[PDB]
Amino acid sequence: KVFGRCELAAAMKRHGLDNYRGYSLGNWVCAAKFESNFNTQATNRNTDGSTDYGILQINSRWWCNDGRTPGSRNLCNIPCSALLSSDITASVNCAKKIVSDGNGMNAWVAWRNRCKGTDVQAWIRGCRL
């Protein structure tokens, strides 16, 4: 599923992501924009052989099981496929664990490089929330 901007903001809010760990909703929307272009089926292979999955490009090295990342963990206790669903519940639940892991949203390198410090409220501008 390819979400609209405000559609995704609303789904993230429903699932309690807004201001989770102090990160306003526009931070999450901006991160999704640059990680997946709002496409739940986004995947991207890393050089190390891990894969990133879904709207927030969550990595199999630590967070989900795909059966093909040797030595990896599955800290969200989910198949990485669950991260590609139209329903974002698994992605949001796992994102909450990632953002609580110590480095905040810096776990998402695209958020650090393209969202951090910017006018992230623009991402929820105009949205009926």
Q: Does 60 bind Na ion (CB under 5 A)?
A: yes
Nearest Cα to Cα of residue 12 among 1, 117, 24, 98: 24
**Residue 7 bears catalytic tag:** no
Among 36, 51, 57, 72, binds Na ion (CB under 5 A): 72
Alpha-carbon gap, residue 110 to 91, rounded angstroms: 17
User: According to CB under 5 A, which one of 69, 78, 88, 94 is a site residue for Cl ion?
Assistant: 69
127 touches Cl ion (CB under 5 A): no
**Shortest Å, Cβ 89 to Cl ion:** 18
Going across the sheet that includes 58-59, the strands are: 43-45, 51-53, 58-59
Q: Which residues bind Na ion (CB under 5 A)?
A: 60, 65, 69, 72, 74
